[model samples]
Target: LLRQCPLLLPQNREGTAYEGFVSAQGRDFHIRILLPTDSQLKNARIECSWHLKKILHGYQHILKQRLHSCPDLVSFVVELKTILEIALKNTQELHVPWPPEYYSCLIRDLEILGWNKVAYVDTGLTTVKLKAEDSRGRQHLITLKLNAKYPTEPPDCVVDFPVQFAISWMPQDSLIDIHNQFLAALESLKEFWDTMDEIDGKTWVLEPENPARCATSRRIAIGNNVSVNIEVDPRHPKMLPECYFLGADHAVNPLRTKLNNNMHLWDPEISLLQNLKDLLEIDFPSDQVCNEPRCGQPFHQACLYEWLQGLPSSRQSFNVIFGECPYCNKPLTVKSS
Candidate 1:
């Protein structure tokens, strides 16, 4: 057996009920339940206030029927359904099972940030996964978990980096606010990722024989053992690295000067290794290298002279002579004629 009340029934009316907020003119009201009661049964009251402003024509019919019995509320309902649009506080429940609107807001905020997109939303874990990039074009993966007490409790986040990266956390009162703040922090860290990407993308992993002695080292060769030591700041990938010759002064000096002075021409879009190779126009570790392990040895007397000439000269026979092997400190210079 069911009881029905004409006062609450708008089913037979010209329009159904508008199931949303209706704050018209000076009154804030929930139009569906037109007869306001304090019985603690599902109810909301309209009070006089200037904050009311939203109304949509398409939804007017629904509001009209809701106020059908309460003829006194009819005019206010009319204004609320078809007059103005105003802001309202969210009526979403962000705890326990959570609400669809709560998740929607999270997705909407992710979209608004522009740089990141929701890759997947794991409702089971109450987590959101995002794919984002830094300005330098490095990609990042982030996971945000909102526990059942989210908004009331701050969410936890994890990021993938060489070493784990996390925001220095302080206690938070609202996770929604914290998530928005984290979006800004994540954007700022893009620059840091770009620098790391550049370093990793370079010749760091090319060969065990060509291991970078220092973690920051990146080098390229113009000829056998003839190379430039690349010193990168990571902040400026488009700018050329500070270059110094590694094997011989004759082999790497001129190229170093050219690379250093014309660094402005370096295009970030082009690979730095390719640019150096094209500029040097010489393949490194030449076929004519001498078989001596200690001596990257000689391609010719002049090449040897150039290599030895770069060594510290010792005073001998009234002239500064190439005195010792650059590698072994062995006395290898033949007596000058």
Candidate 2:
């Protein structure tokens, strides 16, 4: 349940926590996210599924070599899971074997869940977190790189890890051998979750105890960018150009635009933004400064619109405070108190 947003990487894994933020180029940006600070125990955690074909296939050979043809029998499952949890314990009480086969297998498992196992292996620790426990105490989680279309025609999911972490996105024929190494990392999480109080019977969290105070915890995630020269796609010759903007900088837009009568390049783009009301928090005339929603930013408008940047952001705009939140159809209330 690690936050998908890169900004919230646990600066210190020792404490349970959640964070989110945005990154650009080589820099990280901090934003204020509304955390479930009061702990009402709602659906407070985020869980993302993964596709892990290589890891599952690699497990076939490993499973066959076990005492029985299957390695997941009731008797062996617990013992197997225990061994894995030990290898990746954060403080290094134990160590998972490392080599081409084992690490590769572990790597695939980690990648499937969007983690870099090699990096985690370097730290020599894995989290021990149990995703769920059913009424009959049957625990389950699924991971595999399934074919794009699935479920209707028996999804192409290969059972890669009995329980694993960070393995996602690999070709079917791939191989990485030490699948148990993934358990080590997971056990760390498992142990932590066990000690926490789950006040809400149904709600869960990855690590609500996190204390590192992530500097960028409030940001959203921007997927990694690949550096490549212009290359044409044979099918759609124009596809290459169209993809270029996928990595283009959002800062170049109005958010960072210079404000002035001459600084009016945002005519079309700004107008295209349908929910101006939702994005900006605007207070009324008295509090409204000559040129900004910044100086006395109303909480309502600020919540919807990300802050507009300017040295005089807090200087207040004298412009008539107007704009409605498109989502709720409410006059965006900018909080004065």
Candidate 3:
């Protein structure tokens, strides 16, 4: 055994025990073997390092049977090297690395699309973020997770929009192609964003204080404790939206009635904000008063009316009661119940 495989040598003068390293496919594995004095091959005990045991996982019985049948230690070592080679080949086949051409192809595509357009890329070059601008100059980002068979297989796409962004891809499609498709998609939603931008700029949006590109609903503040939630269709921004009034009955009933009564006035030719204003019959209110920071108590009209009417210094004029807050002593005003 020592002459055939110089790496593994006998550990005892009797040559009954051996402990050393064996090299296979540039990998080394430490192994120890002890042969019984009476029955050398049948009663041989073998021990292997963790990695070697892992490689010989499912072949444990086969290895033991071979050790019992093999004529000599050198023959068993040869068999072990053969098994290791097969195991390494199987692992290599399962985890095959991508060819250099795959990266070169991706680089060429990015070059054609302009490296400046790339917003981000992962260290592994698998995920890439590309920036695109619509006709209105609105910036948008699209993420592409490249598959191992990239260019041959379509990459997974992610984007922010009211609608699902689907890409049309082919084996010949490059990064620039997808980017152009993304831009076209953004163009289709331009009018929808324009309407939302106008409403955000002109009105005080309450819910979704900071709106994302995909948000289709807006809770627009109309008055103190009063607001209108509208869901605008991305495909038809000019059309009248589904409206739900949110507030106390006294505050919301009138606005709801106004919206219903003037529903016929909504014109697709007009902008969304103007259509809403015309239907609701009021300019949305933005500001209101509150008590001192230390005592900012809120009151309903009916509660405030009853409290103000009970005060000795309260006065009434044209059905409006004026008094001071009982808790904060701040001047309070409300219409009589």
Candidate 3 lDDT score relative to the true structure: 0.54
Better of 1 and 3 by lDDT: 3
The TM-score between candidate 1 and the true structure equals 0.29
lDDT of 3 at 233: 38
For candidate 1, the 10 contiguous residues with the lowest summed lDDT are 1-10
lDDT against the true structure, each candidate:
0.41, 0.28, 0.54
Candidate 2 runs further than 4 Å off: 1-165, 168-185, 198-330, 334-337
**Rank list by lDDT:** 3, 1, 2
TM-score of each: 0.29, 0.16, 0.51
Tens-digit lDDT string for candidate 1 (1-337): 0132112334435233333343423334443333343222123223222223332212333443452333334443443334334222222222322444566455545433453433454434445555343345634444444432343333445555433345545344333343445555654445545554554454432132432312244454434544555435343345344445464567556666666755765544444544443444424333123345654443334334334333443335345455434433344542231
Give stretches of model 3 more than 4 Å off: 1-126, 148-150, 233-237, 287-337
Which one is best on lDDT?
3
- For model 3, how does the per-residue alpha-carbon lDDT over 222-289 read when each residue is reduced to its tens digit? 66765666545345545666556564458767877776777677655664656665456656666114
Tens digits of lDDT, candidate 2, 1-337: 2333454543444322233333322223233222233323221221211212111211223333343223332323243334324323522322222223434435445434553333221222222222233222222233332222222221323321223335444344333322443333444434323211221122111212232111101111122231211111121121111112122255324322322222333242231121110122211111233234444332333442322322223334444233222323333322221
lDDT-superior candidate, 1 or 2: 1
Which candidate achieves the best TM-score against the true structure? Answer: 3
